[PDB]
């Protein structure tokens, strides 16, 4: 089970999957920035 | 009692142990059930071997592992024993093992219609 060519660049790449940890990290950043929006609105 | 281990799910039929004798055509793939029937210690031994760190100490460690298929243990090993570790999984009870008091304590959930063969 090999991915043709070089991984992560070609037309056919290794399937990458989003972990719950990654989702939580992104959501944390989004919350910080929503607060930034609020504090920049005044 | 490594002969009496229990696999969750259908691992007894799906888990496959792969080995190669080195010779061409020497690839052998044996389900967990077949491996267990052949050697009643192999499954636990392989699990521990895979969990141990992959260095030169691993086989020295495996020399300290003593696997016995059944309740019998050699006398010297028994005399060496110091502590017994709690079993990681608590064995669920069967109805045959439940006491009538416990059955009574558990409520009846529904009224079966009287006119039913059952």
């Amino acid at each position: 089970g090999r991915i043709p060519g070089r991984q992560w660049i070609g037309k056919h790449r290794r399937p990458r999957f989003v972990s719950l940890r990654a989702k939580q990290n992104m959501i944390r950043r989004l919350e910080i920035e929503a607060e930034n929006h609020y504090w920049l609105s005044m | 009692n490594t002969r009496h281990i229990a696999f969750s799910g259908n691992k007894w039929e799906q888990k496959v142990y792969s080995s190669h004798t080195g010779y061409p055509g020497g690839f052998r793939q044996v389900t967990a059930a077949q491996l267990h029937l052949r050697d009643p210690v192999a499954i636990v031994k392989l699990a521990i071997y895979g969990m141990l760190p992959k260095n030169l100490h691993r086989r020295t460690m495996m020399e300290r592992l003593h696997l016995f298929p059944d309740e019998y243990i050699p006398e010297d090993i028994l005399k060496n024993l110091v502590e017994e570790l709690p079993q990681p999984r608590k064995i669920p009870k069967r109805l045959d093992e439940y006491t009538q008091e416990e059955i009574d304590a558990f409520p009846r959930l529904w009224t079966p219609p009287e006119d039913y063969r059952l």
Binding site: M26, I27, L30, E33 | -
Partner: protein
């Protein structure tokens, strides 16, 4: 004329000047022929794609064979193949200019109706062969009535209004929240994350 009209392979007068492969004509929601017109059933395009003359013949033959001429009538909601796909020779090294016209084809965008049926007949009577034709089509397609089309649309607004996710693709893309516009296309601001290439994700709010 309660029958589906025959579609020519290529326009009678061709385009002397070769034109570029503007894939934008397949990318994104369809803005034309998105609504029913003198009909009750149709084939909805749930994705973008190019309809070759072979697809046109498949549709025409299947529908004409499997509809009642006197009651059921059909109408094309898509122009005839008009975009030349200048497929080059059957082997040659790259270069030498642009290729020559070999096939003609009509672009289709998601949300576009391809064929529209009508007449005295209910939806289930037609679902069978319309669904077969939809599967035959080169893009995702669906046999849709007027009622089902409006139902799925209203469901889409219901989703957009009731989702409990505080984070929507629209909010994040428009606000450039995580600098994600460094990863998104400018078209994503208007596709709202529901379109990726020529594929349309209906399940996604």
């Amino acid at each position: 004329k309660p029958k589906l009209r025959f579609i020519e392979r290529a326009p009678l007068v061709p385009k002397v000047r070769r034109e570029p492969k503007n894939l934008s004509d397949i990318r994104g929601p369809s803005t034309e022929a998105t609504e029913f017109t003198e009909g009750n059933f149709a084939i909805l395009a749930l994705g973008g794609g190019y309809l070759h003359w072979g697809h046109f013949e498949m549709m025409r033959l299947t529908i004409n064979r499997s509809m009642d001429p006197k009651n059921m009538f059909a109408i094309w909601r898509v122009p005839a193949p008009f975009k030349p796909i200048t497929r080059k020779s059957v082997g040659h090294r790259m270069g030498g200019g642009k290729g020559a016209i070999d096939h003609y084809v009509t672009p289709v965008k998601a949300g576009r109706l391809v064929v529209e049926m009508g007449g005295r007949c209910e939806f289930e009577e037609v679902q069978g062969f319309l669904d077969q034709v939809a599967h035959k089509l080169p893009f995702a397609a669906k046999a849709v009535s007027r009622g089902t089309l409006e139902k799925m649309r209203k469901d889409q607004e219901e989703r957009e209004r009731n989702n409990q996710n505080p984070w929507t693709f629209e909010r994040i893309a428009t606000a450039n929240m995580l600098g994600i516009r460094k990863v998104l296309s400018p078209y994503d601001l208007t596709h709202k994350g529901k379109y990726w290439g020529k594929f349309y994700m209906p399940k996604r709010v």
